[PDB]
Design a protein around this ligand. Sequence first.
Ligand SMILES: Nc1ncnc2c1ncn2[C@@H]1O[C@H](COP(=O)(O)OP(=O)(O)O)[C@@H](O)[C@H]1O
Ligand SMILES: Nc1ncnc2c1ncn2[C@@H]1O[C@H](COP(=O)(O)OP(=O)(O)O)[C@@H](O)[C@H]1O
Ligand SMILES: C[C@@](O)(CCOP(=O)(O)OP(=O)(O)O)CC(=O)O
Ligand SMILES: C[C@@](O)(CCOP(=O)(O)OP(=O)(O)O)CC(=O)O
Ligand SMILES: [Co+2]
Ligand SMILES: [Co+2]
Ligand SMILES: [Co+2]
Ligand SMILES: [Co+2]
Lengths: 327, 327
Amino acid sequence: AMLSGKARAHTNIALIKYWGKANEEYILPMNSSLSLTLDAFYTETTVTFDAHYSEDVFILNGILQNEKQTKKVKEFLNLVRQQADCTWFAKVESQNFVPTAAGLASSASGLAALAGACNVALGLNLSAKDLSRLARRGSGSACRSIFGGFAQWNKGHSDETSFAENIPANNWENELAMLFILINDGEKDVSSRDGMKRTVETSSFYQGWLDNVEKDLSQVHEAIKTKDFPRLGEIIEANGLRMHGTTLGAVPPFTYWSPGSLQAMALVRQARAKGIPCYFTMDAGPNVKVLVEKKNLEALKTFLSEHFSKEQLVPAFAGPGIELFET
Amino acid sequence: AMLSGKARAHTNIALIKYWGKANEEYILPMNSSLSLTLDAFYTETTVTFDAHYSEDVFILNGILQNEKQTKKVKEFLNLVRQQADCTWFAKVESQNFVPTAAGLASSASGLAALAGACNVALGLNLSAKDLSRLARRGSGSACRSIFGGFAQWNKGHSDETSFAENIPANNWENELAMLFILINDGEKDVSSRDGMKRTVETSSFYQGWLDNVEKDLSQVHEAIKTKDFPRLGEIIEANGLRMHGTTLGAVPPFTYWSPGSLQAMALVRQARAKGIPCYFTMDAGPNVKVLVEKKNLEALKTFLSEHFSKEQLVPAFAGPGIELFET
Ligand SMILES: Nc1ncnc2c1ncn2[C@@H]1O[C@H](COP(=O)(O)OP(=O)(O)O)[C@@H](O)[C@H]1O
Ligand SMILES: Nc1ncnc2c1ncn2[C@@H]1O[C@H](COP(=O)(O)OP(=O)(O)O)[C@@H](O)[C@H]1O
Ligand SMILES: C[C@@](O)(CCOP(=O)(O)OP(=O)(O)O)CC(=O)O
Ligand SMILES: C[C@@](O)(CCOP(=O)(O)OP(=O)(O)O)CC(=O)O
Ligand SMILES: [Co+2]
Ligand SMILES: [Co+2]
Ligand SMILES: [Co+2]
Ligand SMILES: [Co+2]
C-alpha cells in the first residue's frame, strides 16, 4: 500500500515580476508575470505515500527538515491529499542544486518538482496546464517552472484560470544567457511570501507597481516578436527596480539589496557604457542576474571578474520544462 | 561705486524631505519640509557689486569657477539685481566648510550665505521671513538655513507664502546630535535639482510620496511637543526611505545610494538592535546621517568604527541661523 513518484524541475527567473497575491489561500496573483527557465539550477524530488508512515517527513539535501521548515511542504501535501482523497502520510526527499531561500528561486524548482512527483505518485494524470495550477498552490513562481524557456503566468481570476504557459519566441531564448552574480548564497532575512504580503498591505508604492506591470508585459511581448534585445533589457531592468522600490514604501520599509547588490548593478551599467549590452534584474534577495546575449557572456564574466571571484559568476542558459518519472 | 556684504550660514539636514518643485521658476515646493540646522558644516561668503567689474566672478574654495559652475550663482545674482534694479556685475568669494555637491547640503549653506551677503551689500534690510524667501530662489533647502535648530519650510502657494521659520522645541534640539558617515565626499552623479525634476515628471511612486508627507510632518510635530525620540526617529527614517524609493520608479530609474550607504544603514539597524536608539536619513547622495541623542553619540561612533575610519565619522550638533556682517 505505497504510491511513489519522482520529478525534476528547473528554476526560473522572473523578467516581469510576480509581486503580491490577490488571494493568499489559492495563490492568485495581483498581476501576470513572465520568466525564463534556466538550465543551471534545478531540483530533484521523490515522494512516497505509504499507509505505514506515521508522519509526514521532509528531507532536503540529505538533511531532515524540522517542523518549522516542513510546515509549507505539509500544506502542499494536505492540498494534494484532499485533491485525491488520500489519507496517507508521505515522505519527501529532495535535493536542491541551487542555494536555498537566497533569492535564486529554489521555491520555484522545489515546489514544481514536488507537484510533479505527487502527480505521478497519486496517478493524477494532469495536463501541463493543470500541473501548473497545482504547483501554483505551493509557490507562485513554481507554476512557471512547469514550462521551459519563456513562460507567462496569466493571473486569471480564479483557481481555474490562473496558470502558466510557454511563450514561443522563435528560438530567441536559446540565443540568450543569464549570468548570476552570487553576492550571498545564505538564507535571506525576509521571505518572498512575507515580503510581498507586507508590500501589498502597507506600501504606498504598490499602486504604482500595479499601474505599470501590464505595459511592461506588453512590451516584453513586442520585443520577443522582434527579438529586440535592448528593448527587452530596458523593460525588465526597470520592472525589477520598480518591484524593489515598492519595499521602501512598506510600513516598516525594508530592502532585499545588500552592498554587493548595488556594486553589481553599477557594474552592469559600466559594462553597458563600455560596449557590452546587458541588463540586470533581482528576484527577492541580494543576488544579481544579468541578462546578456550568449555571444557576450565571456566578455561580461571577464569584466565582472575584476570585482568578483570565479565562485561568484555562474552562467546559465535556457532550460527545459518539468520532467516526470514513474518509479 | 562699490557695495559689499558678508554672511555665514550653516547647513541643514532635512528630517522631512523636500523633493520636487511645484514651480521651477520660483522654487515653490510640492510639499512642506523640516530640517535641523547643524554646527559642523557652514559656508562663508562675501559679495561685491562694483561698476568697474566687467563680468560676474565666482571663486569657491580659492578656485575660480568656470562658466558651467557659475551658471546658477549668476541666476541668483540676476534675480537679486532685478529686486534692487542694480546693473553692476559682482564678485562672489565663498569658502565651503563642507564637501561640495556630495549630498551634505552645500547648496543650503552656500545659497543662504549668498542671499545674506547680497541683502547686506544692496541694503535690502530683509526680515528673516523675506530673507528666507530670497534664499529659496537660489536653492530650496537654503531657505531653511536662515534659521537655527529645527526649521520648517511651509510650501505655501506663491512666492510670498513659501518660506521657512524656526520650530520651537523647548530646547530639545540641543539634546540631540547627528553623526555623519562619509561614504563618499566626491561630487555626486545626479544633482538634487535634476533628480527631483526627473522624479516629479516620471516616477510612478511620486504620488505615494506626496500622499504621506503631511502625515509625517504632523507626527514630527507631535513628537517634538513630547520630546518622543523613538517616534521622531521612526518617522524620519521612513520618510527618507520613501523619498529614495521614488527614484527607483523614475523613467529611467536611478539611485543615490552607494554600497557603503547600505552597509551604514544596516549597521544603524544593528546598533538599534544592540541597544543604541538611533535612526538614519539620507539627503540626495550616498552619505548617511544618523540622528542620535547626545548621550549615545560616543557609543555610536565606537560601534561604527568597526567598519569606518575616524575620517568617516563626523559628529554635529544643532547650529545657529544666518549671521550677517556689514563690511
Ligand atoms: N526542494 C524544496 N522542497 C520544498 N520546499 C522547498 C524546497 N526548496 C525550497 N523550498 C521552500 O522554499 C522556501 C524559500 O522560498 P522563497 O522565500 O520564495 O525563497 P527562494 O529565493 O529560494 O525562492 C524554503 O524556505 C522552503 O520553504
Ligand atoms: N558656496 C556656494 N556658493 C554657491 N553655489 C554653491 C555653493 N556650494 C554649492 N553651490 C551650488 O550647489 C551645487 C550643489 O547642489 P546640490 O546638487 O543640491 O548638492 P548638495 O548635496 O551639495 O546640496 C553646486 O554644484 C553649486 O552649483
Ligand atoms: C520577486 C519574485 O522573485 C517573487 C517570487 O515569489 P515566490 O514565487 O517565491 O512566492 P510565493 O508565491 O509566496 O511562494 C518574482 C517572481 O518569481 O515572479
Ligand atoms: C533630498 C533633499 O536633500 C533635497 C534638497 O534639494 P536642494 O534644496 O539642493 O534643491 P534645489 O531646490 O533644486 O536647489 C531634501 C531637503 O534638503 O529638504
Ligand atoms: Co521563491
Ligand atoms: Co522569482
Ligand atoms: Co542641495
Ligand atoms: Co537636504
